[PDB]
Amino acid sequence: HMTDDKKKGKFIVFEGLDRSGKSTQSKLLVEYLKNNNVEVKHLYFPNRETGIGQIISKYLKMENSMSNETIHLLFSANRWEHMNEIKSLLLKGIWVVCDRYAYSGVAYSSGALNLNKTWCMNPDQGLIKPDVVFYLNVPPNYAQNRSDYGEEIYEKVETQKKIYETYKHFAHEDYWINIDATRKIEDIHNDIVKEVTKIKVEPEEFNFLWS
Amino acid sequence: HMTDDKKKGKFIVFEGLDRSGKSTQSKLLVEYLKNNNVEVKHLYFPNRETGIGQIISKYLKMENSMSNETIHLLFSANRWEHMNEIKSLLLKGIWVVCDRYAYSGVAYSSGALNLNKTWCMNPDQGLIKPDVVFYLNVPPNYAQNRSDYGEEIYEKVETQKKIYETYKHFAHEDYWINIDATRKIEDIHNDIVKEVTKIKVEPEEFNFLWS
Ligand SMILES: Nc1ncnc2c1ncn2[C@@H]1O[C@H](COP(=O)(O)OP(=O)(O)O)[C@@H](O)[C@H]1O
Ligand SMILES: Nc1ncnc2c1ncn2[C@@H]1O[C@H](COP(=O)(O)OP(=O)(O)O)[C@@H](O)[C@H]1O
Ligand SMILES: Cc1cn([C@H]2C[C@H](O)[C@@H](COP(=O)(O)O)O2)c(=O)[nH]c1=O
Ligand SMILES: Cc1cn([C@H]2C[C@H](O)[C@@H](COP(=O)(O)O)O2)c(=O)[nH]c1=O
Ligand code: NA
Ligand code: NA
Ligand code: NA
Ligand code: NA
Ligand code: NA
């Protein structure tokens, strides 16, 4: 009752290759939720505004160079420093719609940096687990013509090919919903809405990666 | 031969409670090695001068506050960004004498922050393993009168008591050498020298935590 510590909002993550449409789709979903009287906050990773995120942003823009393990652990620490906020929102009944999470961490590091997958998962163990992940599936060559593509470190077609394969580490999980993202914006969004309307709305216990 | 990738220097770590004499002893050992014609570099963790180390230094000085997991992972990332340097030194035949390493990470986080020990070890898995660790053993109340004690976050006797117990996670390992550090500087140093002279001097393969 008073000490109720149940998760009341839902936590939805978008995952996908670079420029696959995650910001596009997460903003449309947020607007749809607001229109159906659901309180919701839009979050994303990496958050480049924190001290850790600033270092990350320099890495992505090739303004610095860092060893594979060092940058992998910063991407994870950047999520941890948001756990208090995500937990509080969800306890309040506010939904969280989030562009990228720990699945990006594992897929990008194991595919682009060739880090060991179990080693990559470890530091994200214990993060709050989302209700669903929409994976905006595009082939590795598909998005190379969209606006700023090639500006940041992983945006080369040969790297995207590797990350496309390591995203399959999650492809058969029950929380993972493959979405064909080589379609019109509105078609993709309608599929996402269809899936979101099946989410069961009741307060429940928090769960944690990698359960 | 030409592609020889053998570890040629030795890697010695000092561990110990706050103000237990690690900088004192590591400088004396460095001077002793130089006097016996051994090339050596003195390193220490956290390195507060990097981008990551700056954030760490603010945490230790209570200039910011951070969640337990976030700061734990930064302490680990701070070691990783030194692996290229430590590896190169050791390949060259330069010894590395280092004030604190991954054992501090595990002992401080599991003792002061109550983090799960296996979770704390994971991100340091894969770091280069030292030849020996001297643990400058002092009781948890012992150092409270030494110069700047109480300036930084963990320097309260009740926290030191907890970290004293979690340093025992390594107490029975073959690389771990307990040194009674409640003695005169010169007596402690003579014990360390005695142990250092038993190290076998030949080139060998690198080993890695937590083997
Ligand atoms: N399905 C789509 N069809 C055409 N253009 C799209 C589609 N989805 C997104 N875009 C455009 O592609 C670019 C990248 O989209 P964005 O949502 O920013 O990708 P991400 O967040 O995955 O990097 C933007 O210019 C966006 O307007
Ligand atoms: N064995 C000792 N006896 C008396 N004073 C010592 C001894 N070892 C170190 N000190 C003094 O204690 C303080 C902390 O020593 P330091 O080597 O800086 O500790 P740490 O590096 O472990 O924090 C310094 O003022 C140092 O001169
Ligand atoms: C969240 C996360 C993102 N990334 C990559 C995915 C993108 O290439 C870049 C983030 O940029 P974005 O989401 O604008 O594309 O960071 C990681 O490598 N590890 C992570 O943990
Ligand atoms: C290297 C390391 C140090 N620490 C603590 C030990 C000290 O209290 C502080 C470092 O300060 P120092 O070595 O001057 O004392 O950081 C950690 O908590 N985790 C680590 O991984
Ligand atoms: Na990108
Ligand atoms: Na985005
Ligand atoms: Na699925
Ligand atoms: Na200290
Ligand atoms: Na020191």
Ligand code: NA
């Ligand atoms: Na021993």
